[PDB]
Structures are given as C-alpha cells and as structure tokens.
Amino acid sequence: AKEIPEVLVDPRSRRRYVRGRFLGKGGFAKCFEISDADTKEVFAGKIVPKSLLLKPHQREKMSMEISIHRSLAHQHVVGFHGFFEDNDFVFVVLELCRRRSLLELHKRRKALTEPEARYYLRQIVLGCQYLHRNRVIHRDLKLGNLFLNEDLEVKIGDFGLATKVEYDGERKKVLCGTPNYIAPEVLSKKGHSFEVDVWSIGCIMYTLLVGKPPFETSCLKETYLRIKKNEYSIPKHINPVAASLIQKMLQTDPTARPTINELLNDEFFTSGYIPARLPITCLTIPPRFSIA
Numbered sequence: 085a086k087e088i089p090e091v092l093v094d095p096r097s098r099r100r101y102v103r104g105r106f107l108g109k110g111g112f113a114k115c116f117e118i119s120d121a122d123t124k125e126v127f128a129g130k131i132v133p134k135s136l137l138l139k140p141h142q143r144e145k146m147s148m149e150i151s152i153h154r155s156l157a158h159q160h161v162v163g164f165h166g167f168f169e170d171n172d173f174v175f176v177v178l179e180l181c182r183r184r185s186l187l188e189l190h191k192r193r194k195a196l197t198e199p200e201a202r203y204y205l206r207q208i209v210l211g212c213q214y215l216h217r218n219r220v221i222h223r224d225l226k227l228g229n230l231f232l233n234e235d236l237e238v239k240i241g242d243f244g245l246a247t248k249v250e251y252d253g254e255r256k257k258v259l260c261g262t263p264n265y266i267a268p269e270v271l272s273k274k275g276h277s278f279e280v281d282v283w284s285i286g287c288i289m290y291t292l293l294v295g296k297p298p299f300e301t302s303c304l305k306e307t308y309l310r311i312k313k314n315e316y317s318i319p320k321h322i323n324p325v326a327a328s329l330i331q332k333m334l335q336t337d338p339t340a341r342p343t344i345n346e347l348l349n350d351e352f353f354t355s356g357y358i359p360a361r362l363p364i365t366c367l368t369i370p371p372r373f374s375i376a
C-alpha cells in the first residue's frame with residue numbers, strides 16, 4: 085500500500101505541513117489541502133508516489149514541469165510555493181484554489197452570460213500573455229486546467245505539457261501527451277509554437293458561450309478529422325462580435341490567428357461590459373448584472 089504521511093516536512097525551508105481535507109486524484113498525484121503548522125496558511129498539496137515514477141522519462145517530464153512552473157509568478161497563474169521529497173513521495177506546494185476549475189463551473193452552468201465569458205477570458209488571456217513573454221507555451225489550456233480561487237479569479241495550472249521556446253522561430257516537433265483542445269498543426273505534425281495556446285483559448289471561448297466544445301464527437305479520431313478540416317459552426321444566437329473573435333482564433337493556418345497580445349484589444353473586450361468581479365452566486369445562478 086504505502087500510506088501518505090499525515091505530516092509533511094520540508095528539510096531546506098524547515099516548514100511543516102499538516103495534511104488536511106482530500107481534494108481529488110489526477111493521474112499519479114493525490115491532492116490535499118495542507119496547512120503550515122506555524123503559519124496556518126492553506127495550500128494545495130500535489131503528492132505523487134515514486135512507485136509511479138519508476139521510469140527515467142516520467143521523472144524528466146516531472147522535472148521539466150517543476151522547473152517551468154516554479155519560474156512563474158503571476159496573478160492568473162497558480163502560484164508555485166515550493167516542492168520537496170522523501171524516499172517514497174514527491175511534494176508540490178501550490179496556491180490553493182478553493183472553487184475548483186472552469187470545467188466544474190461549465191458542468192453546472194453550461195453556456196455562460198457574455199459578460200461572464202469576457203470576464204474569465206480576459207484573465208486567461210492575461211495569464212497566458214505572461215507565459216508567452218516568458219517564452220512558455222502551456223499546450224493544454226482547457227477548462228480543467230483553469231482554476232478558480234475564492235474571489236472567482238482565474239489561475240492557469242498544470243504545466244505538464246508545457247515547454248519553453250529556447251530560440252527564435254523554433255518550431256516544436258514533440259508533444260508527449262494529448263492536449264484536449266489540440267491545434268491542427270499539432271495533429272498534422274507540421275511543427276508548432278505559441279499559436280497553439282490561442283487556438284485553445286478560442287475553443288474555450290466557444291465552450292463558455294455555446295455550452296459545448298467546438299469539435300466534439302463520440303470518437304476522438306473523428307474529432308481530429310473535424311479539427312483538420314476546420315469543421316465547426318457557431319449557433320446563430322451567439323452575437324456577431326463574439327462569433328467573429330472565435331473565427332479569428334479557430335483558423336487552421338497558425339500565422340493567420342491573432343497573437344496573445346492582440347486579443348484583449350479585440351472589439352469583444354474593448355466595447356463589451358466586463359464586470360470587475362463576480363459574486364459567488366455565479367457558480368450556480370446566471371447573473372443579471374443589474375444597476376440596482
């Protein structure tokens with residue numbers, strides 16, 4: 085079996101952490117609320133057993149993730165607060181996001197109001213703008229990788245498929261993993277860079293407004309044939325300006341898409357109502373956005 089330790093100690097930083105409430109399993113890691121015994125502050129604790137990292141390549145992938153993720157501090161990126169290990173386990177200490185991800189929100193709400201979509205998309209774009217000037221492609225932007233804190237602020241997490249562009253006009257040929265909103269240039273194996281993230285944000289924009297993902301079928305390889313052919317449609321009730329931004333992002337030619345630093349200056353953002361913040365009720369109930 086090999087049980088997880090009830091207390092978790094960091095030998096370099098001399099910080100102790102009590103294993104609180106269980107949050108959920110993703111792949112290898114069991115995640116937990118964890119408390120500094122002295123500071124009482126709460127974190128998310130990613131906990132992977134080393135019995136699942138028996139392979140050097142699985143260790144290298146985990147090293148790259150930490151190296152990339154720890155190099156990052158931004159308002160709309162999950163804060164990296166440190167990592168450590170004993171003989172049996174690896175430990176990652178992260179910014180806690182108490183209201184889970186946009187996937188859970190979408191499962192409960194489906195199509196959001198337009199101002200809600202603007203609101204979440206502005207923050208995702210901001211977070212992803214910081215990644216891109218820091219030469220990081222995330223490569224798996226999706227609802228489940230987009231976390232919400234107590235104030236409904238977005239935090240991009242999970243740099244497991246992330247890579248760093250080391251030189252100019254470098255085209256990545258390797259992606260060990262399967263992104264959810266995978267770009268057509270990844271699928272056709274042509275080479276890829278930053279535009280991959282904009283593609284995925286366009287899929288996110290569609291899903292948040294329409295209430296279902298743009299290329300979904302019963303078969304994953306059929307989905308991939310739709311992505312290759314650019315085979316999707318926007319329901320007529322979606323406003324023309326929103327529809328138009330989606331179209332710009334969901335182009336096959338990566339050079340034809342807009343840059344991450346172009347996005348926030350689109351008419352969709354500059355000329356629509358963006359709330360400063362959302363009440364907690366928005367997890368469950370469509371906001372009306374009254375003046376009362």
Ligand SMILES: Nc1ncnc2c1ncn2C1O[C@H](COP(=O)(O)OP(=O)(O)NP(=O)(O)O)[C@@H](O)[C@H]1O
Nearest residue numbers: 107108109110111115128178179180181228229242
């Ligand atoms: N700060 C956090 N607060 C709460 N849960 C978190 C936090 N960071 C990570 N998690 C999670 O632990 C899991 C680990 O991620 P994992 O499932 O391996 O990859 P993923 O692509 O992020 N998410 P999924 O979309 O669920 O496959 C997530 O699904 C969340 O449940």
Ligand SMILES: [Mg+2]
Nearest residue numbers: 109110111228
């Ligand atoms: Mg998971």
Ligand SMILES: [Mg+2]
Nearest residue numbers: 149242243244
């Ligand atoms: Mg990961």
Ligand SMILES: [Zn+2]
Nearest residue numbers: 141259260261
């Ligand atoms: Zn591999």
